[PDB]
């Protein structure tokens, strides 16, 4: 694709999220860079409205799959870069077991030389003193695989996957993700054969940062189609 040529090296990234969880309004801004050559993302996120009212680990999947590393023999299956620079819409429902759910609508596209992820998030039916509103999750993230399938009828892709959030007491909080992506432009895009993306995350803090924040390192690699 012509879109793949935009990802030959490191690309700057801006992320902007506005959220509303049980009526709590909040905003997050992130800045960093990504490199599809090795699938590596490095970003720092700040809550610009004060303390984040949900746990940082619950927002990782929401806060840029165009930076996934697709091996050479899988390049014809990279929908995400093929939709660039005009970009794509990414929509999810994220259901937390025994608790509420998120609905997200995001646009991922180039604005100048910067890859921009803009998100609106709504969270509803979350429980008082639960793991989410009560901030009972470990500040960590488990590695995960997520399977991608073509959605020919919408000229996009779909994905269903589960995230395991470790809870402080040793239990696990499941978050069931249902995802759809559609191109913003009307140009041709690549609809893939079935495959998956493999993700590894590292969450840390900036020792000189006084705002509520998250430093994120992420690797994402495409797999599941062989030579």
Domains and CATH numbers, the chain: 3-223 (2.40.155.10)
Q: 186: Cβ–Cβ under 8 A, 6 or more apart, which residues? A: none
Tokens of 92: 């999810």
CA-nearest of 63, 37, 68, 219 to 143 is 219
DSSP H helical ranges for the chain: 79-82
Residue 27 near residue 15 (C-beta atoms within 8 A): no
Neighbour-count burial of 112, counting CB atoms closer than 10 A to its CB (0-12 exposed, 13-18 middle, 19+ buried): exposed
**What determination technique applies here?**
X-ray
* E-state strands within the chain: 11-21, 24-35, 40-47, 88-96, 101-111, 114-124, 144-151, 156-166, 172-183, 195-204, 213-223
CB atoms within 10 A of CB 17: 22
Q: State the residue for tokens 């609106």.
A: 120
CA-nearest of 146, 149, 151 to 194 is 149
Tokens of 85: 């620079």
Resolution (A): 1.9
């Amino acid at each position: 694709s012509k879109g793949e040529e935009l990802f030959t090296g490191v690309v700057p990234i801006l992320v902007e999220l506005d959220g509303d969880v049980n009526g709590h309004k909040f905003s997050v801004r992130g800045e960093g860079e990504g490199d599809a050559t090795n699938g590596k993302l490095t970003l720092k996120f700040i809550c610009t409205t004060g303390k984040l009212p949900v746990p940082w680990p619950t927002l990782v999947t929401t806060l840029v799959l165009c930076f996934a590393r697709y091996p050479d023999h899988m390049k014809q299956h990279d929908f995400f870069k093929s939709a660039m620079p005009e970009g794509y819409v990414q929509e999810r429902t994220i259901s937390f077991k025994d608790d509420g759910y998120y609905k997200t609508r995001a646009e991922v596209k180039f604005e100048g030389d910067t890859l921009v992820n803009r998100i609106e998030l709504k969270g509803i039916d979350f429980k008082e003193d639960g793991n989410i509103l009560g901030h009972k999750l470990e500040y960590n993230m488990n590695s995960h695989n997520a399977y991608i399938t073509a959605d020919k009828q919408k000229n996009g892709i779909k994905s269903n996957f589960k995230i395991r959030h470790n809870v402080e007491d040793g239990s696990v909080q499941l978050a069931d993700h249902y995802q759809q992506n559609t191109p913003i432009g009307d140009g041709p895009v690549l609809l893939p054969d079935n495959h998956y993306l493999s993700t590894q995350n590292k969450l840390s803090k900036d020792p000189n940062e006084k705002r509520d924040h998250m430093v994120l390192l992420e690797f994402v690699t495409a797999a599941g189609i062989t030579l």
